[PDB]
From a paper:
Previous research has demonstrated that Ino2p/Ino4p heterodimer is associated with the transcriptional regulation of phospholipid biosynthetic genes. Mechanistically, Ino2p/Ino4p could specifically recognize the inositol/choline-responsive element (ICRE), followed by the transcription activation of the phospholipid biosynthetic gene. In Saccharomyces cerevisiae, limiting the extracellular level of inositol and choline (IC) leads to the formation of an Ino2p/Ino4p heterodimeric complex, both in vivo and in vitro. The regulation of inositol metabolism is crucial for cellular function. These genes possess at least one copy of the designated inositol/choline-responsive element (ICRE), the consensus sequence (WYTTCAYRTG), or conserved UASINO in their promoter sequence, and they are regulated by their corresponding trans-acting bHLH factors.
Here, we have resolved the crystalline structure of the Ino2pbHLH/Ino4pbHLH/DNA ternary complex at a resolution of 2.25 Å. The crystal belongs to the space group P3121 and contains a single copy of Ino2pDBD/Ino4pDBD-heterodimer-bound promoter DNA (Ino2pDBD/Ino4pDBD/DNA) in the asymmetric unit. Each protein in the heterodimer is comprised of two helices (H1 and H2) separated by a loop, as illustrated in Figure 2. It is note-worthy that the structure reflects the fact that the α-helices (H1 and H1′) of both proteins are symmetrically positioned in the major groove of the promoter DNA. The molecular interaction of protein and DNA might be an important characteristic of transcription factors in regulating various cellular processes, such as gene expression and DNA replication and repair mechanisms. The crystalline structure of the Ino2pDBD/Ino4pDBD/DNA ternary complex indicates that the main interprotein–promoter DNA mutual interactions are mediated by several residues in the first helices (Ino2pH1 and Ino4pH1′), as illustrated in Figure 3A. In order to investigate whether these conserved residues affect the protein–DNA mutual interaction, these residues were mutated to alanine.
Residue numbers in the entry:
A (entry chain A): 1 to 75
B (entry chain B): 2 to 74
The structure:
DNA sequence: GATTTTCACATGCAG
DNA sequence: CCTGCATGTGAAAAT
């Protein structure tokens, strides 16, 4: 049967709420795994994204540095 | 004049500017992340993209640890 | 078609 | 007072 206005409205609210709760959980995972990202920053999207990108860049840089060191230990 | 309405206006626009700057930071982040190919030309929701971020972080940490053990052998 | 999901928005309010 | 984050909702994209 056709959903009533009230049923449509709260389905809308809950769908939004669940997705925000989903995003926030990932924010908390990023706080946990990004050294320089602090729990106080766990709901500041701009800072999460910038510090995550910085961490990615450093991780790739480290990867380069190690590969060269192996290529060096084999001379 | 009405400083109250000006302050209301400024807060509205500065929220929209915060959203713009947040979106720019997000797009910069996502351009450096292995993301799924757009099947059927359908947008990828932010939270799916965020999972790709977490995956890439974990994936490269591991690779680096594996590289570290090789360097210690 | 109707419903779900997502994005963007204007606003309330803690600190 | 200011701002940064939280909320439900309009409109649009996806299902």
């Amino acid at each position: 049967m056709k959903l009533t206005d009230g049923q449509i409205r709260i389905n809308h609210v809950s769908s939004e709420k669940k997705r925000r709760e989903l995003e926030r959980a990932i924010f908390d995972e990023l706080v946990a795994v990004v050294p320089d990202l602090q729990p106080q920053e766990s709901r500041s999207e701009l800072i999460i994204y910038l510090k995550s990108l910085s961490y990615l860049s450093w991780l790739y840089e480290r990867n380069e540095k190690l590969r060269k060191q192996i290529i060096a230990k084999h001379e | 004049d009405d400083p109250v309405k000006v302050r209301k206006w400024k807060h509205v626009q500065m929220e929209k500017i915060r959203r713009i700057n947040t979106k720019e930071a997000f797009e910069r982040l996502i351009k450096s992340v292995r993301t799924p190919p757009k099947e059927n030309g359908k947008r990828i929701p932010k939270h799916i993209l965020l999972t790709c971020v977490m995956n890439d972080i974990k994936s490269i940490r591991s690779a680096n640890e594996a590289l570290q053990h090789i360097l210690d052998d």
